[model samples]
Target: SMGVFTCTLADITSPVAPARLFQAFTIDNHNLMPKVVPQFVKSIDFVQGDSTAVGCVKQINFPADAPFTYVKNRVDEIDASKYYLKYTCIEGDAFPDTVEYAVYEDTFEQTETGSRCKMVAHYHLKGDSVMKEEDVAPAKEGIQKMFKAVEEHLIANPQLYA
Candidate 1:
């Protein structure tokens, strides 16, 4: 049940600035996500603390047809200067399908063309859970889809969060 586990998601030419992206990642994340990637998440509402601060827990309300009901996400770290953010699914059914829980670290770097957003998810599978490349494939694709959706939305609405 124990083996190496990691999943990475990337958006090389992120359409928004680091600050804007950080905003979306911190407070506006759940709100902006459903607007673009509703397939993975339907609504994001806080269960404790403000959305922008660390230690805050938010419930991810997935669609009724989705595989799971909801998951609990907690912000663990937020650093604006380095454009780094980290959070964990303190309680969630999404990744529990494959692992016990997941800690996701996101980084946004300003590049000449645009910003590069990278997300690394470190997973801890349960005692009986088996980790495999195939196990993480679906989630990888979903992450990419979510990033693309956000990028496309930003491209279409440059005025937003300006």
Candidate 2:
């Protein structure tokens, strides 16, 4: 049966402010990620639509050693004021045979020390396919690594995206 398996990937806290973190993570990630985590992300380019619009599609290209060469992501929703974003992976070599596509939601909340980010993932499976914990673990790990690298970059260079 074709279905969706939803999971909360992480709720991570950082020393960066919500607005700044949100901007770096959601809006300027294409520019920041390749700089901060070049080992994993080689580049990100808008293949369709506007960069900040809901219908825009971005293709994230990975390094040779990475698991996947590239993945196409379409923006589903974005709220700069609210620090929220929703996107879906429409096509990619990163997707396994069992998965048809994946949806992700990210929300940043303010905290006394800095900010907290909650990430949720929805894995849509193909007919007769099943999703297992191990199958999704790598993606979670990848996001956490990316988040940490970006956080470190932002902290080291406070002037950026401020």
Candidate 3:
């Protein structure tokens, strides 16, 4: 059995408020993410349950120019008050042959200036395939870009998700 590779993809601080950022990034991401980063994410749709509930599955489709076609994620947990979200990538072309699945946890904290977010990812490997940091570097960069795009969107439109 191969052990999971855990990585902290991002620990970012921003001027956006925790609640607002949480609402836009986690709660309303299905709608907002595609709008913010259309070049990377073509669309996001809930295929299984409601977006607000646990166990809901969301499919994120990438653009034609992108590497992968789509990824399906199942929401494991969400908390509005705490600004926390957990989800697992159950199906996707994004996964490498050695990767079985990926678990992601996103959390926002209220900071003195504004807010900060911590994004963590756990990669479960198949068989005895060893995972390296470089193997996931592109994913980390993609995540950071997505987060920055969302932040910029929120900053541009203060009325949104307020």
Candidate 4:
């Protein structure tokens, strides 16, 4: 079925190289996510193994307001070299829609100062459980917060990924 709602953000920059950013995005992502957005995402449990390359999976537990207070989701489609990944709901207590998915796409080009990096976070929603046309803008705005967090992580800790 055609995606009902869609949004796009382009040219998101990162100081870290595309390969480094890509690896950090996949391997180091969950580590900082809790501290980044503890309210929405309480904690993530690596269901089976460590987060390294593609085919990694995890159960992302996000806050629920109610007694349950969380939803479990399996993560996949991790491509470190490509600097992107796709995630979806697979287990119990999903985020609405039977098949809600999110993807982060990154591309890099050589430049004088450094390699230019561009990224976009895309999503697909089904049925309808919130998240609409208006939400796209705000959600994209949230990506800025994530970007800032990444930039800061890479800058303060130089040679960390080198």
The 10 consecutive residues of candidate 3 with the worst lDDT sum are: 49-58
Cα lDDT tens digits, model 3, 86-156, are 99999989988888878999899999989999988888888998787788888789888988888898889
Candidate 1 residue-wise lDDT at 124: 76
Model 2: how far residue 71 lies from native, Å? 0.8
**Model 3 segments more than 4 A misplaced:** none
RMSD of 1: 2.2
Q: lDDT for every model? A: 0.76, 0.87, 0.87, 0.56
lDDT of 1 at 47: 94
Clashing pairs for predicted structure model 2, backbone only: none
lDDT of 4 at 133: 54
TM-score of each: 0.85, 0.92, 0.94, 0.64
Once all C-alphas are superposed, what RMSD does model 2 give against the true structure?
Answer: 1.5
Q: How accurate is candidate 1 locally (lDDT)?
A: 0.76
Cα lDDT tens digits for candidate 2, 118-144 = 988888789988778898788778888
User: How far off is model 4, as Cα RMSD?
Assistant: 4.4
In the range 1-162, model 4's lDDT, one tens digit per residue, is 346343455456444666656554546667867775565567777766675444556666667642344443345565555555655445544334523665545555445555455655555655554665554555456556666676677777667555
Determine the backbone clash count of candidate 1: 0
